[PDB]
Amino acid sequence: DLGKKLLEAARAGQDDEVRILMANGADVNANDRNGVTPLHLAADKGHLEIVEVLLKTGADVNAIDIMGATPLHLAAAHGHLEIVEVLLKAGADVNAMDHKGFTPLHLAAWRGHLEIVEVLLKHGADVNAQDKFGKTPFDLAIDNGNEDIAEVLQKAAKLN
């Protein structure tokens, strides 16, 4: 009953309701019927404070949804550098993979977030990982018109 509300408080950025429902015993690791937790919703929509209170209260940092997306996949895709660093510091798997084969580095490169790419590479991101169709983060950067990220990923792969 509370988990339903808490999920919505995270999406809507209600820093207040999150501290209400969660204080009344709302499951911090609550689920919807697609596996999305409050932490996924905070990371997706960029609520750094909600991410930090959910992690402090024991939110699974490496939780997953029906499609295998972790909070880090989401913060990396949507460009939330701050949340990315929080999640990584909290223990997020830098090379986690979704059911489509995408790592956070795939998404950050695809979406033109130069800053997150180097953070992920400094946390051990696999620059050679591949999706189901065999595309690297380099490949995705090229196809989507992000020349600068492609050059970084290329020099990181060439390091000898």
Partner 1 sequence: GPTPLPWCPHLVAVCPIPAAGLDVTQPCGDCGTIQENWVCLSCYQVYCGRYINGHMLQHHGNSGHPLVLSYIDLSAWCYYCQAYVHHQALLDVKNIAHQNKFGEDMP
**Interacting residues with partner 1 (CB under 8 A):** 32-34, 36, 44, 65-69, 73-74, 77-78, 99-100, 107, 111, 132-133
CA 72 – CA 45 distance, rounded (Å): 12
Q: How far is the CB of 81 from partner 1 (least distance, A)?
A: 16
Which residue number, 28 or 75, has a Cβ lying nearer to partner 1?
75
Nearer to partner 1 by Cβ, of 86 and 140: the residue is 140
Tokens 């880090």 belong to residue = 72
Biggest alpha carbon distance in the chain? 55
Cβ closest to partner 1, residue 4 vs residue 155:
4
**Shortest distance, CB of residue 73 to partner 1, whole angstroms?**
7
User: HEC string of 124-146?
Assistant: CCCCCCCCCCCCCHHHHHHHCCC
If the CB atoms of residues 32 and 85 are measured against partner 1, the closer one turns out to be 32
Distance CA 87, CA 82 (A): 9
Residues 6 or more apart in contact with residue 135 via CB below 8 angstroms:
106, 143
Between 133 and 158, name the residue whose CB sits nearer to partner 1.
Answer: 133
Helix axes 114-122, 81-89, angle to 10 degrees: 10
Nearest residue to 125 via CA among 72, 74, 80: 72
CB of 7 to partner 1, least distance (A): 12
In whole angstroms, the minimum distance from the beta carbon of 22 to partner 1 comes to: 22
CB of 120 to partner 1, least distance (A): 15
